[PDB]
Every structure is written in C-alpha cells, then in structure tokens.
Amino acid sequence: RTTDPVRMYMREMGTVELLTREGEIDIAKRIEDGINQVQCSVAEYPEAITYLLEQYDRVEAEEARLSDLITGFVDPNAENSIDPELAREKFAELRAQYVVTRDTIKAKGRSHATAQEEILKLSEVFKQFRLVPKQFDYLVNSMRVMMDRVRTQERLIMKLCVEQCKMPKKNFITLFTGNETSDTWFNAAIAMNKPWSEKLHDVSEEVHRALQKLQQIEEETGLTIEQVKDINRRMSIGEAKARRAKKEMVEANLRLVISIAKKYTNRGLQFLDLIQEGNIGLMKAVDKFEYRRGYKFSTYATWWIRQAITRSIADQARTIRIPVHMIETINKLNRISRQMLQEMGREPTPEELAERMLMPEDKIRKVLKIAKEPISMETPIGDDEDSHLGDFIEDTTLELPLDSATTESLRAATHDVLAGLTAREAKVLRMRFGIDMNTDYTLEEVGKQFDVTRERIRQIEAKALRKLRHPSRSEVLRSFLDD
C-alpha cells in the first residue's frame, strides 16, 4: 500500500532504458530531415514563398543591424561575427529568384518541369538559410491559421449539404471537393439520371452563396486547393517526425539526469521540484544539441541543466526573493570565507578581507544586513509549550483611547474659543485650514471667490493672534503646548 509517489515515479521511469551512438544520430537525422521537408513546405505556397526577402528587407530596412533578430537569423553552422558585406551581397540574388519565380508560375500555370526545378533551386537558396528562431513560427502560423480556415469552410459546407439531399453522402464526397467552384459537379452526379433529380429547389441559392466565400480566400491566399492539402499533410509529417523522435532520447538519458541531480541535492530544497526542473533544462539541452560537434551529450545538457537549476534555486528557495547579484556575491563570500579561514586559521576581519576581496567594508556590512531569513512566528520560545513566540507581540499601529479623548478635548476647546471670535475671523480661520471640513482652501481662490485681498488677511491673522494669544484664551492650549 505504498502511497509515496517517489516509488511510483522511480518505478515508472525505471521502465525505460537508453540507447546509444547511432540511434541517437538517427533521431537527429530524422528530426532534421522532417524539418527540411517542412522547410520545403515553406519554399512552396507561391505568393507566400517570398516570406524570406520581405522580412529580410524588413530587418535590413533600418540601415544596419546585427542585433537580437539577426542573432536569431541565419546562424549557419560549420561542418559568425556578422560582416554586413555579405548581408549587402545577399539582397541581390534573392530578388532575382523572386522576379524569375513570379514570371513562370503563371506561364500555363504550375505543371512545367523547368519551372518547378527552378522552384526546387529556389527552395535550395531558401534552404541555405537555417530554420532560424521565432520569425518563422509566425511564417508557419501564417500557414497554420489558414489551414484552420479551410477546415472551417468544409466543415460548415458539409453540415449544410450532407444532412439533406436525399442520398447519404458518398457522391458528395467524390463531387463537391473536386469542383467546389462551379455547379458542374452537380451535372456530373446527374450524369447517371433520375426523375427525382428533375426536382431541385430551395437550396440553390445557399450552395453558391456558401461558395461565394470560398473563392474569397483565394485572394487571401493566392493558390490552388490541391497543393494546400498537399502541404498541410507534408509539413505536419515533417513536424510529427521530430515531435516523436526525441521522446526516445528524452526518456533515454533520465538516469543521467538523476545522477547529476544528486550532485546538487545539498539539502536546501525538495526532490520533485528539482527533478521536474532538471527535466526542463534537459528539454532545452535536447532541443538545441549538435551531434556533429561529436561530443558526449552529457556535457551539453550538464551545462544547460546546471544553469537552470543554479538559477532556479536562487530565484526560489527563500521567503524573500533576492536577485542574483547578491547571490553570486554571497557565494564568493562563502568560498573565500573558508579559504581565508584556512589562511588565517581563524575568522577574518572585514578589514583585511575587504582588502583581499578588494572592496571596502561598506559593501561587506551592506551585505551582512541581508544574510538572514525569517523565523516562523509559531516557534516555542516558551520552552514548555506555554508561549510560542507569536503570542508576545503587540500591534503598535492603531491608537490609544486616552489620546483620542485628549485630541477631542482639544478640538472642542478650540470650538469654544473660536466661538468667541468675529464671524469673518473664524470662518477664514476654519476654511483656510480645513477645520470642520474635508477641504483646505487657500490663497488666490479667495480673491477669485471672496474679492481679491491677500495681504490684509495676513494682517488680520496676526491681530487675531494678538487678541487670542494674550494669556486669557491661550490656556486651553497651554497644556497642549505640552503635547
């Protein structure tokens, strides 16, 4: 009755084993080949072939770049510090292939051997450019989404046509999907005969109205219909190729993952967290790898997953997040602490250690304000289980009732004082400080409200201080002087 999923998962992964040294590179081959045939699929789609020089002129049209996107782009590998000379070189042949391509795809259409061998070398000059990152996903999404439109169209049309006519479907299968543009399929079905074909009403408008949106996607796309269903299938296969291929390899090296794991299982955190994460960094390490480098893949994914885990522990693993500059500084400290302790034989001072670490005690101490973690309210600082620490604290945030009474007595005595004043005086002195109000009216507006005056207000103010200050009304304050 083992509920521990440790046992479960380790059993379930012990299921699988590893293979080596050519099934590995066979999977690489399979992957890259299916990818090259999705690349072929890209080099198809005539007016969408040319999503190379368009976006390439795009990244070029800002007069010079080597930055993020071009560091994504071509990046050809060698069985570069980008020199823009070759960039400028490669905006001349591409346009040439374009113009000579748009000339021939209309000459009789698309069945002409030299034309499609020119499209083959077009696909080749396309294929000298690697299947570089994000930008082409879009370009595939461009082709991915439109698929999900014709898949829309058909699925609509079927429901309208199939559910009715009289006979179930099969003639519809063989008829509509071929023609789908004129009503000649109808007369082709009626090639057989019958008296029940002579009656057709009440759906004639719906068929060609539904059709009316069909050709609209042609201008959206600019292609035949057959080649669509060709390239959909072709590319999907070139994808699924690699999509499968690695799950052999992913499941292959798992024992290595754990093996290198229990290097860094230095008790700071929990298993499945770290396990999951190592699998994750491994996902990349698989996604990225070059066998032609000819090395052991262990080394590759070791680098990758080391990084992944080394940063994920630092991100997580505390109550407070602590960015990494602190972290690396802290690890330096932890190592040279021990080094300098061997040197000294003793604890080092911030003095000579600031010297050796080559920077002042400022940062030392600035760090040492950080080095602590929290200590969990509910601990028993009551040794007998009598008072856990949380029970000691008072909240010194709200207020004290005696002081509320104090300030209320203040406010009421000021009401009493101000009650003995001239109307203009106390109204000025109220609204000008927002006493009694949510407001605090001030200088200019009064002129713009009352009339003008500003300075004689000040003069009034001082004389009011005169008549009130004289220690006859100043005593309801004189103990709030002590406030």
């Binding site: 521990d4 602590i322 005696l402 104090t406």
Partner: protein
Amino acid sequence: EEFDAIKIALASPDMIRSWSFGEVKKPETINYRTFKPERDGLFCARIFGPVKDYECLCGKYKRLKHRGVICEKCGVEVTQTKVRRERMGHIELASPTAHIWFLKSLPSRIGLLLDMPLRDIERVLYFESYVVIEGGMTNLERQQILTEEQYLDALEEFGDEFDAKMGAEAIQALLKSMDLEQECEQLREELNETNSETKRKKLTKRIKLLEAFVQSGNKPEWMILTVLPVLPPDLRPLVPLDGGRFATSDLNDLYRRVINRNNRLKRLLDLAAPDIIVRNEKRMLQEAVDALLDNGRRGRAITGSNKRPLKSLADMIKGKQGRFRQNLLGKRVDYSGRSVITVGPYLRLHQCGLPKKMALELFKPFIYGKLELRGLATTIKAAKKMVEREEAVVWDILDEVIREHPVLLNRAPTLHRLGIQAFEPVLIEGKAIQLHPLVCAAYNADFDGDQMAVHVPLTLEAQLEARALMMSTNNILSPANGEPIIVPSQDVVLGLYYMTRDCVNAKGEGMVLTGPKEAERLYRSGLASLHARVKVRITEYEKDANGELVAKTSLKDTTVGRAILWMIVPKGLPYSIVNQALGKKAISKMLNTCYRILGLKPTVIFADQIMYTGFAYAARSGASVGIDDMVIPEKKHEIISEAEAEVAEIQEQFQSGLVTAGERYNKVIDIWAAANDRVSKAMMDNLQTETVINRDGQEEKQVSFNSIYMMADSGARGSAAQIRQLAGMRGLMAKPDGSIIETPITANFREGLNVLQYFISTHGARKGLADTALKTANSGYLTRRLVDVAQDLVVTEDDCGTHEGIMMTPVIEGGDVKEPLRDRVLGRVTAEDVLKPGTADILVPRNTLLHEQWCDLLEENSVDAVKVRSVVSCDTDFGVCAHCYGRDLARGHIINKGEAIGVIAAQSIGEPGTQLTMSSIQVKNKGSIKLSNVKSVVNSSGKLVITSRNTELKLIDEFGRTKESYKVPYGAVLAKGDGEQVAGGETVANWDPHTMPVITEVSGFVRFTDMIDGQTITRQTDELTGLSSLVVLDSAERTAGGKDLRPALKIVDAQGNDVLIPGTDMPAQYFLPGKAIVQLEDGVQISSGDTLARIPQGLPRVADLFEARRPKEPAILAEISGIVSFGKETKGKRRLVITPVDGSDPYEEMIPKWRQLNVFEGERVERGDVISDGPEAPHDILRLRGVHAVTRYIVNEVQDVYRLQGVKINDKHIEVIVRQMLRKATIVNAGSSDFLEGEQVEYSRVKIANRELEANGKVGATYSRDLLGITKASLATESFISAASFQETTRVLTEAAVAGKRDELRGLKENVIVGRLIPAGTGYAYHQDRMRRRAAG
C-alpha cells in the same frame, strides 16, 4: 450588525468569484530593502488594501484632489484602509483537484456515495490506471477499471466507443453525468424487494444523500477545486523586529509553494510534454493542497529546517489551540489584577483587604471624569500630571469613588460557583490581601503560598448583579445539599470548646448569679473558672405565638463560658443546645437552628461574633504542644516480646514444613494488626482518662490534660490515626507493588526511625503522591464533558401540567437507614394526592412544597413510599417546569424560573470527585418479617427453603417500616418463616455457600434412566464409601455418543410416571449439567426440598457508569415469558429453543454454555429473568424493562460509590442528565417519515401530538426508545457549533455543510461566543422579548 441566525453552505466557484477582489499571480511579496508589498504577490495593496491614508505608492494621486483615483502606474487605490483583515483574493486553477475532507475521512461522503471502493479511486487518482467514465458500448461498464496496459487492449480493439480516463476530469464528468432521481426511486423500490439489514441501511443511506442533494440544491461537482481563495495578510502576516529581524507564518510558504508548481504546471503546459511528467506535477499540486488542509493526514508530514511540521490551516481550530478553547471561550481581560494574599481576622463579611495602587490604577477614568468635574485637572493631561504629583485629594477622591463599588474575587482551579465571590473594597497600607479566613473552606484554600486575582463590575448591571447575587449574604449553602459551608474551621471551634467546658477543678463552685454580665465581672475579677458548672439565671425567648416571641426565665447550673456566651445569642431559643461541650457538629446544627428559626442575619452576625470571641478567648486560653504532651504507654514492650516469641513459633513450624506461606502470611499479619490494636487501646486508656486531680475530694477524673484528644473532639484537625502514628505504631507499609509488608513498625517519631523503616516509608508515600499528582486530569476531563452535555437545559415554565413521575423509598438496605425517605422527600413535590396510614388523609392536591413541617408530619406516620413529579415526567418541550424540580437549596425556597441547571449538577459532581478515589443469616434484634415474590417450601427440615430465587429477607420492625434487608439464595436453608417474630441475635438461615441446590421439591423415586456410563456421563463410584449415582461430566469430558444427548436421571413413582411439577402437568426431571452429581443409586427416593445433586463452587467504575460504557459478560435474561428448551449443539455456541405460552417460540441465540446457566433445559421462566450469571448491561434493561427500574438501578449504584467515601449530594442532580441522554427514540412503524430512524422523542411527541390526533387516527409510527454514549450524545445535536467546538470537529463540519444547514442560537454556548446575552436568567426576559418579536414577525 444584528442578525437572526447563521448558515453553512457549499461555496460555488462563482461564489468565490463574487467574494474575491483580484486574482493572485506570483510567489514574491516584497523588496529586500524597500520592505514593500509587491504587485500581484502576497501583499499587493491593489487587491487587499492600503497602508496609509490617501497615498498611492508613487504618490501620484493625493489629498483628495484625486479621491477615487486608482494610481494607474502602480494600480494602487487611494481610499481608506483596514481591509487587509477583510479582503480575500483568489486564484483560478488550471485543472481540477479535489477536496480531501469529503474524501479521506470515515464514511467517505464522495465514493461512499458512488458505491465504489476507495483504493480503486486511488489507483485512478494517483494516476495509475484508467477507468470507465462511460461505456459507450455496454460491452463494458461504468465504474470499471482499466489498467493503462489493458486499457490498450480495450483501446486498440475499438478505440472509439468508450469513455475511460484517469483524473477528476474523468470524475466530475461522472458526477456531471449521474442523475439522482431515478437512482433514488430505484433504491426505494428494490429495497422493498430485498430490505435485509446491511442492504437496507445502505439503500437508505444513498437515498438520504440523494434527496439531500435534491432538496439542498448543493451539488456533487462542488467537491473539487478550480478556484481557490487567498486570505488577507493580517491573518498570515510578516513583521520585523527591533533588530531588523523578520518573522512569518507557516502558510505563506505553502501558498508560495503552490504558485511555482502551478507556474511550472502551466509553464510546462506551454511546452507539450509526455503525460507522465504532468501526472507527477499534478501529484505535487494536490499534495500541496492536502498539506494546506492537513500537513500530516494522508502521509509523512512536511517540514522546513525546523525539522518540525508546518501548522495546518486546520490546526488553527484544533485541540484547545484554535479559537474555541484558547481565544474565544477563555479570554484575557482588561481591568483585572492579582496578588499574594493573607488574612484579615478583624474583618466582616463584605470587606476585603486591598493594596491600594491596585484599585488606584484600576479606577482611573472615574477619577479623570471626576477631576474634569472638579476642574483641578480641567482636562486629562494635567490629571495624570497631578496623579504623578501625589496629592492627598486623590486618595479622598479615590475613597470618594470606591465607596459602594463592589468587586470580584478569583481563585483557580474553579471547581464550583462558590470558588469565586463578590465583596466590597477596603484599602490598606500593604501589598498582601487580607480576608475573612473561613471561606478558605469554600475555596479549599490555605495561607501557605496561595494567591488570587481580581475583577471589576464597572457597569451598573454588573455592579448590582454582584451586590445582589454573589453577594455572600445571598450565598451561604451548597446547592448540592442543605449544608452550611462556613463551618468554623479550625480554631474558633477549639477555643470555644475549651470555653464551654465542665471541669470540676478550677474554683468558685456552687455559687449563684443574676446574669452573665456579672459573670464577666466575677471571673474577670479573677474569682472564678470560665469552665465550671455553677448556678445562674437566664431569660430565654420563644416565638410559640404567631411568629411572636414569648418570653420566660429561670435558672441553670451551667458552665460560666456558656452563660457568658448566651449574651451573644438572639433570643429565640432554649438553653439545651448550649448545654454541653459542643463538638463542631453541634455548631453546625446550631447555626442551622438559627436560620431554621430566625433566618439569616441573626445567624450571620452571631457567627461573626462567634469567630471574634473564639479568637479572643482562644488567644487568652493559653496553648502549646510539645515533646511531653506526646506520651507513650509502658504496656508496649511486653505485648511486643510476647507476639515476638510467637512469630518465632510459626517460623519454626514452617521450618518443620507444616504451614504454607499464605497461611503463615495471613495469620502473621492478623497477629501483628491485633498487637497494633492493643497498643492503641493501651495508650487510649492511658491518655484519655488517666489524670488524677483532686477537687473537694480524694481523686477525680474528667476531660483529659494530654492536650491531644480534644483536638480531634473539636473537629479542628486530626483524629486517632495520626495521634497513633505519633505515639504508637503507624500501621503497616507497602512497596508500590500493591503487596503487603510482613514486619511492621515499632518506633515512632517520638522514639525515632530505623534506616530501613524510613527507607520503606518512602514507597507508598511516593505512590499515593503520584496519584495525588494525577487524578485532576481525569477530573477536569470528565466534568468538562458533563457541562459539554447539559448546556441546553433551563427552566421555562411554572407548571408543565404533567402526569406523575418517580417514587421515593429509603435506601436503608443491608443496615440501618442510609437515606431517610424524609431526607429524600424534602423540597420535592408530590406526584399525586398523598394520604396517611390513617387512610385517605390527603394533604397534597397532587403538589405541595414539601417543607420540613410536612416531613415531620410524615415522620410521625409509618408511611414508607411516595411519588414525586419527576424532571423526566415533566414534559416541557425544551426546558422544564419548576415544579418537577422544586427548591433551590442555597436559596432555600422553590426554584424560580430562568436559572440553568445542568451546570449546577456538573459542579456538584465534578468538584468532589477530585477528592474521592482515595453460610448463615443472623437476625440482629426483633422485628416483623417480609418475604414475597415467593415460591418456597416447608423443607425436609420443616423449615423454609426458597423455590423462587426472587425472594430475599428483611427484618421489618413491629410497625411495618423496614429495619434490615439481606439477599437469600434459591433453596438455602432456614430456621424460621415469614409472618412470624423472632428473637434478636439468631442465625435464622444457613446453607452450604458452595452449593447451588439442585433440590427436588417433588417426592418421587430414583432410577437410572436416560443416562449411561461413558455416553452422556461417566460412572465414578466413590472409592471410599461405595454409594454413588450416574456421574455427570462437564460439557467437554463426556463422550460424543451422548454428548448431544441431554443426561437426565428421572423422577418416577412405583409405576414409572413423571412426577409432574406440583400444580402443573409439566414433568419433573433434570437434564443434569456438569457438577450435578448424585450420590444415591437407582431405585432410591428423594424428599421435597432434596438435592439429588449439589453444585459446588472507584473512579473508573463511575467513569464507565456515566459514559454509557457496557460490559461483555451478561447474566443474560428472559426475552419473553413461557417455557424453553435448549438448542443447536455448540458450533461455538449452543442455542436456545424458547417457547412462549401464547407467543412465538423460534427465538434462540448463541450461548456460551461454558458459563453456568440459571434455567434448565425443561424449566420455565417469565420474561425479565436471568439465564446466565455475571454482570449485565443497561441497554438490556431499557430494551426489556420500564424506566423507573433502570434509572433507579444506576442512581443506587453510583450513589453508593460516592457514599462509600462518605459523600453527600442530593439525588435530584443526578436525575437531570438522564433526560439529556434521552433525546432520541428509534421508530417502530412507518407512514409519517422514514421507517425506524432514531429522532427526537420530543419531536416524535410533537408530530403525534398533531398527526395521530384526528389529523389521523394514525398515519405516523410508534417508536422504541434509545440510549447514547455521552460524548456522541453531545455530538448528536441540532446545533453543530457546540458539537464543533471540541472533538471530532472536521467531520461534524463537513456533515453540517453538505446539507447547507443552519442554526438558531438557543443553547447558551451558541450565544456566548457571538457576544449576545444569555438565553436565560438575566437575559431570559430580554431574549423572550426577542422571542416574541420573532413570533411577532
């Protein structure tokens, strides 16, 4: 604020959407340096609320220019704060994981419903095996598991037409599938097809869950979690310290945990993984979820570097630790204090020592209002300044406050209502609290390091409640008993004893007085003895007239102390009570007479003066005690040497090999204990009456001069035992084994121990001290459960108009009176008109207050039994009439409505139990004899022998009310009869205490028949004499050829007939079991009453008694009247062919005939007749008998357990809880509701008080009556909150929520914790006003 009632329900997901203010999105909370709430983390003010007044974080919007202007940069509010304790955020989940309380706990509530095993579902939900969501084809079946590899078979076979997955997705769907109604009618239907027991209850169970979800509208899919709340920070906070050091709660971890996992869930789910990792991840997730609800439930708990578990959400509600027992029902308090304590000997009742600073700081705002009023301190700053300035006026002002301002006195452990009190303040220049010492007797307190706490009645209501209710003048007795609780404890008693004292010795003998004033003058002149019988005159008074004193006067020869003492006395009494040495029992009853006759205040003030004068004349009396007051006799060494040369006798006897150890052991301890007794007697005769002092004569002897005896005689302290220990040997000693030591003690503390004697003294001392260190836990535990039961109960009504209840008869049995029926009755009220032995002399019209005039009027009468309207026979729904209760004792009159009761018995019963754990029949005197329920016979002696076991003996007096009572065995032998008279001291009965007689009442021949050697029996002819009979073996030893054949030697005549039972055609022969060996052979004859054969041979108790605890070993009984034969031949147990007269025979049950039977294989019983031997269970009694018998049994049992220890409580208390155990009765018939189900017998009585009324002749159902264990009786409650407070809480809460239930706050516990007023007593009137408001809309 005000609201009517509460409710539980199932929170929809959109309910939480409604509750929530924003969704949470990260694990972070703050910066490292700018200790700041981060957005979208934990403490994001944007969703939970702001710190300060009108300050967005970047300060963009400010000072009400931009009032309701969320600062768009930081997205932060502006408006007012204090919602970081209110607002709960939320989180939307990726996928559904389940709640656990509706899964893991007993009966599972979820798969419980689904009629599926748990482990199956585990295999689904540990993601191990797929399972049929739905068999698209019925080729396969819903609720059918497919392993993930056999699933492949099912799959590649078909692929399409099945639904089978592995997860809550598979399951919510199932819930989302399944339709309730059809299932419900189906179970209802096919129950009636086969409604066998387990089947039927299971069908009922599922129908209940069904119709519950129907009519609730609560829903099955709501078990499972797709959105999750998040709490306000202030319940889960994080703060710093003065050191810059930070401190957090557990839960902020766990919230944090899940975030990242859900992040790593969704993060992965961007990335198209194998399912295996997803399974693993989901496991991590729902594991964290469990950990939230319970760290350590499903498995190995979870810790930080603490190495200790993280506290559950649940743990906040739990044990004591949660809100209930720590923070809600017990509370810290403002305006209270404490201090060390001491005595005020001078003081009076209402007074109390008070170190003044205490009241000073505690009465501050009185003084500040008062100084503003005087305007010396015009306002309060200066008031406190002047306070620091220490002006005399303050103190006057302080006194000027303190007058008439009562106050509360508090000691713990508080075991009953009297352990705290309410006094009036008195100020003092010390830091030790002086008080009226006697009430230590109430508090069980002593001035040896005790200390106490104090509280204030600020409000006038409290002020006056104090002055009126727990004013001590309003509280002088127990409610347990009519006992004066202010017994003069230790010294006053003794000084008074010494005073009222009749030497002959001192001087001034035989003179005469006018009155005690000159007695003072005369002794005080130094002429006289305060202890000397001499003549004086008195003038005593009596209220013989209409409560109207009737004066008179005459002389007495009395001691001088007593004359003096009369001066205190308030003029309504004789001299006879004061006519003696006045042991403290006399004081008890004396003060008793005072309030019996005058009432309170005379007795009060009288007692105060008695305390005073006791101090006075005891401090005069002169006293000390020393080495020579401790005295040893001389006749000790010789008894010692004598028995010493006899222990050596039996020593040499064992050396020769004669006696055993146990013989030797018992007899040696007998002689040593006898020597102890002789030593005690010697010193008693040598110290009690030894002194030879002459006085106008040769020699004279009277009350001792040792100084020790009258310490015990006063009752102040001590008794013969302790004094024996000081003087003589102090009994024997034991190692904690429980064994008994052989060589006793010789020395005492006057002489001095051996090494070994003290070494040994160690042991039982340690033992019993350990016991003393632990019986309080069980005590508090039990008493706590007792209050936990009976919180509901309060009087409601004057008279329930009910029909009769209990009968009262004294409990005298086996000795003299143990409870006078007088004492039973007093303050009760009759069930019934009640006449006298003078017939038809009714004096109650079914109910009078049975005060002591009535009781005397009785005790005249020879009446010996009477009925009383019982608390049980009361029928008030949800409370009682005061009549079925009668009187409040320490009131001393009829109970008024409104005061709650169950608590009262609880304090009565729990408090004392702390102290509590630590042949022949011979007539005594003459008297009438009363035996009945009798079959017996003139035996072959001519005397009397029982032939119906029912009967037992009594010695009835010549009158008719009993003297003695003793059990009498079936067929034991007598020397007497019933309806006769006999001399005292006369062995009337005898029997072999080994034999259970097989006596033949018949007279008929013996012939060996039905029985053959070594088939049913053995033949074992006695080697010595020669006579024997066919010798019956036990169940096992006989041979199996006739072991199924009941052996029975048969009674015949000269012809061979069956000598039928005299009076009935039933044959008479004995299917003889083991040990029924007969001695005389074939052809022989027996007599009437002739044995053919013979048959040769505390605290946890009561804990079980009230618990509804139940034995294993019943002296099993007759289910139904009529004849019986025995049954199947022992496939583990024999069975029992019962046969009613007119009923139905077939009932028969497994019997271990290994243990002895009462009735035999051809012998008849009436119902209610024991069949085996042993203890028995209560449920058997209810199930068969009436009630009065039952309750009467148990009360007798446990009252004896008390009284054993010399313990005194009225029976009324114990009646009470009975009706609280009885809150449920199981149904018999049907037609109203479900068939049998236990339900409120109250509400049963309601519905039949509507429905079986001409609503219907009958639609509804008759009903059984039931019983419950006490804790689960507490659980079985309409409310859940009292049920939820303390034990098995989680489960109750779940069960409460599933039906979306609610409560109405009628039990007091319910209305406490909300801060409302009590539904009783003081708030009775208010809350009934509110009641009629609820009645009036």
